[PDB]
Amino acid sequence: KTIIRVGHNQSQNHPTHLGLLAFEEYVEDKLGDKYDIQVYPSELLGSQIDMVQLTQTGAINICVASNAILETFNDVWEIFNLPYLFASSEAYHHVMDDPEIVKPIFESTREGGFEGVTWLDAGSRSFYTKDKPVNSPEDLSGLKIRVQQSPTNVRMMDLLGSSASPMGFGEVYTALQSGIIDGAENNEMSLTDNGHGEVCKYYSYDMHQMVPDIVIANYSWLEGLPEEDRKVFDEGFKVLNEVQRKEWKVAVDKAKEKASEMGVEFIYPDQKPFVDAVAPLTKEVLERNDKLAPFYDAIQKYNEEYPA
Ligand SMILES: O=C(O)[C@H]1O[C@H](O)[C@H](O)[C@@H](O)[C@@H]1O
Numbered sequence: 001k002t003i004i005r006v007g008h009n010q011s012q013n014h015p016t017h018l019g020l021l022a023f024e025e026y027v028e029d030k031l032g033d034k035y036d037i038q039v040y041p042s043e044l045l046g047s048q049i050d051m052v053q054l055t056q057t058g059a060i061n062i063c064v065a066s067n068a069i070l071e072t073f074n075d076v077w078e079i080f081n082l083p084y085l086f087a088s089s090e091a092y093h094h095v096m097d098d099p100e101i102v103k104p105i106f107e108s109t110r111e112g113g114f115e116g117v118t119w120l121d122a123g124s125r126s127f128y129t130k131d132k133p134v135n136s137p138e139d140l141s142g143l144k145i146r147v148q149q150s151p152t153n154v155r156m157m158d159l160l161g162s163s164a165s166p167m168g169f170g171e172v173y174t175a176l177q178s179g180i181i182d183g184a185e186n187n188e189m190s191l192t193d194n195g196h197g198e199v200c201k202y203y204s205y206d207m208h209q210m211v212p213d214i215v216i217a218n219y220s221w222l223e224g225l226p227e228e229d230r231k232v233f234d235e236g237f238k239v240l241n242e243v244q245r246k247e248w249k250v251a252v253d254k255a256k257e258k259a260s261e262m263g264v265e266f267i268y269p270d271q272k273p274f275v276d277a278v279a280p281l282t283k284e285v286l287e288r289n290d291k292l293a294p295f296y297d298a299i300q301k302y303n304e305e306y307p308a
């Protein structure tokens with residue numbers, strides 16, 4: 001058979017793994033005599049940055065990468081990394097499901113060896129810290145906060161009066177434990193599935209970003225598929241999206257409960273001071289990249305249709 005290698009950086013219990021297992025089962029049920037889909041969880045194929053590069057060369061076929069890091073491969077991905085971009089999770093989901101918005105973005109990096117085929121839900125990202133609770137941006141002053149390898153997020157930390165420490169997701173637990181960083185920012189699953197709540201017990205819902213995870217496929221590989229095979233893989237990507245999103249809802253609820261049981265304290269800060277502190281980032285990003293405005297306009301229509 002033809003081996004299709006698929007990587008991601010999450011545990012085997014995470015929604016993304018469950019979605020990819022559904023993908024594998026869907027495709028192999030229709031075409032199993034021909035393809036063996038192999039899913040490599042928990043950074044078995046490397047950190048996310050490692051995997052995107054392996055996808056570019058075709059050493060693996062498909063991987064999952066946070067939108068945060070894709071902006072370094074093509075600047076148009078920056079659009080979904082803007083802080084306080086979406087008014088509501090409903091606005092966000094409708095945006096990511098709108099082909100007129102996502103297709104031009106997903107296809108932007110074909111010359112770099114890959115294209116986006118779907119997205120996966122990763123909730124919203126908020127600050128969590130070890131020693132001191134975050135109630136407003138000034139509480140981040142003098143802290144070192146881990147972010148993804150994303151110039152947008154580095155700039156966001158600068159505007160918050162803080163300092164960014166970019167590193168891969170698998171490094172964060174030990175970096176927190178050793179005191180190399182003071183905190184990080186993510187959805188609630190980081191606390192439980194990745195153990196960050198063992199060290200960080202203050203989780204403050206500033207909800208600065210809703211950053212999609214993107215499923216990317218090697219472009220030569222994908223376009224090389226025979227018509228009928230491509231149709232099955234495409235259907236599989238839709239199943240992946242659907243199963244991951246359903247499982248995400250379940251998992252994030254369980255994560256919140258388990259975090260509480262672990263001793264994490266959830267804080268609900270006033271978001272306005274965070275919004276105002278990082279507003280210049282959106283102004284700067286839009287001014288520098290004129291590809292973005294029409295996507296931003298379209299997102300605003302969804303914000304209006306699905307407000308908070
Ligand atoms: O902050 C990060 O690095 C990670 O954040 C979330 O877990 C996201 O789903 C991952 O794709 C990502 O790698």
Ligand SMILES: [Cl-]
Pocket residue numbers: 047048049050149167168169
């Ligand atoms: Cl990485």
